DNA sequence: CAAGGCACATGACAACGGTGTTCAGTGCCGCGTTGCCCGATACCCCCTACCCGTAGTTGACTGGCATCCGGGCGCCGGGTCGCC
């Protein structure tokens, strides 16, 4: 998608291939998000009972997880579950 | 005895007496209005102290919560699956 964003002309087939791999990356993103939805529910339960509805805390944890995924990469030699909980 | 001569007073004649009025000019005391002079007060500036919003923090850590019955009472009204 970075290459697609550039104004320089790319012939259409390679641009479509770039879009396809970008869509596959988005699907991987969604897979990771659904994988850790369980993580945030436990973390939100870790903070329930303080004037905020449990499902509202779960949604806010979902937002934090979205941030963590958008800022997570394998360059760190650690699992995702360790890096996520801080941002959650 | 009648006519002509001299005294005192007399028809007017202005000008003083004394006092009252005229324009006018200017003040003389009463009532009210005005420039100062300051003094405080709103209103620009500079400085830093502290409130408040945003963004990171990497061992691992991946599904909870306690409900709820002793109304009571009846009806409406619809759903809901058997029934033959």
Based on CA atoms alone, the radius of gyration comes out at 17 Å
- Helices and strands, in order, run as HHHHH
- N-C termini distance: 27 Å
Structural class based on helices, strands and sheet pairing: mainly alpha
Task: Give a count of the beta strands, DSSP E runs of length 2 or more.
Answer: 0
Helix content: over 70%
Could you describe the largest sheet, including whether it forms a barrel? none
Cα shape: elongated
PDB class: gene regulation
Keywords: rna polymerase, zinc uptake regulator, gene regulation
Entry title: Cryo-EM structure of Streptomyces coelicolor RNAP-promoter open complex with three Zur dimers
Name: RNA polymerase principal sigma factor HrdB
């Amino acid at each position: 998608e970075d290459k697609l964003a550039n104004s320089d002309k790319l012939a259409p087939k390679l641009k479509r291939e770039l879009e396809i791999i970008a869509e596959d990356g988005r699907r991987a993103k969604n897979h990771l998000l659904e994988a850790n939805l369980r993580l945030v529910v436990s973390l939100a339960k870790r903070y329930t009972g303080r004037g905020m509805l449990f499902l509202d805390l779960i949604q806010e944890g979902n937002l934090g997880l979205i941030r963590a995924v958008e800022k997570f990469d394998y360059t760190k030699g650690y699992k995702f579950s360790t890096y996520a909980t801080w941002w959650i």
